[PDB]
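PT: before anyone asks, these are the final sequences, not the draft ones from last week. 540 residues across everything. Please model them as a single complex and drop the result in this thread when it's through.
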Amino acid sequence: SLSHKAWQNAHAMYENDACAKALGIDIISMDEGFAVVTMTVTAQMLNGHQSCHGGQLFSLADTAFAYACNSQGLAAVASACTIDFLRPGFAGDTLTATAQVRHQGKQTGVYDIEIVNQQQKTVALFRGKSHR
Amino acid sequence: SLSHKAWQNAHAMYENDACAKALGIDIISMDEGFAVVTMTVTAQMLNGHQSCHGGQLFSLADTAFAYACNSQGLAAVASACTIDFLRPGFAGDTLTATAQVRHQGKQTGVYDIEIVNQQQKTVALFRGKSHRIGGTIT
Amino acid sequence: SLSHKAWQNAHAMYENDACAKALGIDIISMDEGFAVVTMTVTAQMLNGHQSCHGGQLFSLADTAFAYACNSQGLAAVASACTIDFLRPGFAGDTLTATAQVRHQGKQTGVYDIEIVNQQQKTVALFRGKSHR
Amino acid sequence: SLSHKAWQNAHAMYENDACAKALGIDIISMDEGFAVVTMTVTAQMLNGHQSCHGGQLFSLADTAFAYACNSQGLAAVASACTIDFLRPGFAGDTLTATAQVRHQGKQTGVYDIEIVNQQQKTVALFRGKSHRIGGTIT
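LR: through. Structure below.
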């Protein structure tokens, strides 16, 4: 019932935590409809121009997004995502991704995620459309 | 010709692409403004629904995109892009990403990528915008 | 029944035709899941830099899209749209918008629209996500 | 100060903006990187569901966007953008589009626009990318 819903919440949280662990992502701040997580770029994530590969950035943002869904028990997947890359993230940068619900409908939602560096400059903007 | 140059560029890039090699991406087709790459979904890449993670799918699309927009010999990177996820990728699924130039100016370009599984079903649609960053490729 | 569905088709077509009329849009070619329509930019559509305003371009593309939905009886609205503007459309250009279904799900779809000028250069690319 | 300059720019542009005037757009707030504009949905703008047309909604968002990204005094145009439609706009609805800078480099910028109706419900979310085209505004 209620207890199945609670179980699903806890299950979605365990899964999100396992991906975060495996990516080296830490929760810094989290509350209703938002989450701020951090990650350090390591030399293992560099593309040929020595910056963070777009797929790690996309995961870091996906994980922040999952945590923002999960702050309110609203487990969802992304159905679409738009991303502006403004500056590269280099090895050793500490990247902070904030995700924030902007609209939550009956079946779908829109979430914005901003990734910034340790100089507080914007590395990337995402807007995602979610489903569930 | 243009296709031979496109493949030389792609061989140069792939030879030091550890993300592509780590994910098992192979390149199967190359022409100027055009690339087709391939990857098998292994269990390691799955979320809680036994479905491929977005970042792996994004990475596949971004790889066909990097090849297609670097194929003319001018180093270029993504400034922006959009992805629609249409169907899950399940373990064992073989996924083919095809990237095709829609516009290429002196500095900027637009490239459409489609990811299709072995049943010929669309998994995902991506559209990427590139920016040349100066000089020749890595 | 069937005849209600047929009536709705014909009704959606009349509406799309009235918007096209009011925008000066002509059908050039149309078939299952695609439509190619044209429009001339008039001096009444210019912004301050003397090019077509983005909202006329958006309408021209919306109308091509409606006609592509309607080619197969699949009346829909756009829920999201992404647009790259590559070159302006100037007064007197004849702009051709092609719309093409790329995916059609149970409730939703994706359509691509390209607008080109009379020199066959690309003026704008749209990708739309549709609903119905 | 910065806001006074922002409003001078906006008065200069609006004074010859016939699309804004034709659609009844008014400007109500201006600061550097920031603009709020307003419009009432009349019957003339409705589709077959008695709902505002996308192009009118797009035009409203693009107007707040043009104001916000021209507010620093450097002529700039949209190179790309994306819109999510969330709720219909019905006749009589008063719609407010607020545009806020997320990034502004020397040449390019990103601006987020939200359209809200008189019940404070979101109608639409738009994100636009701008490109400066040289010199001062029209």
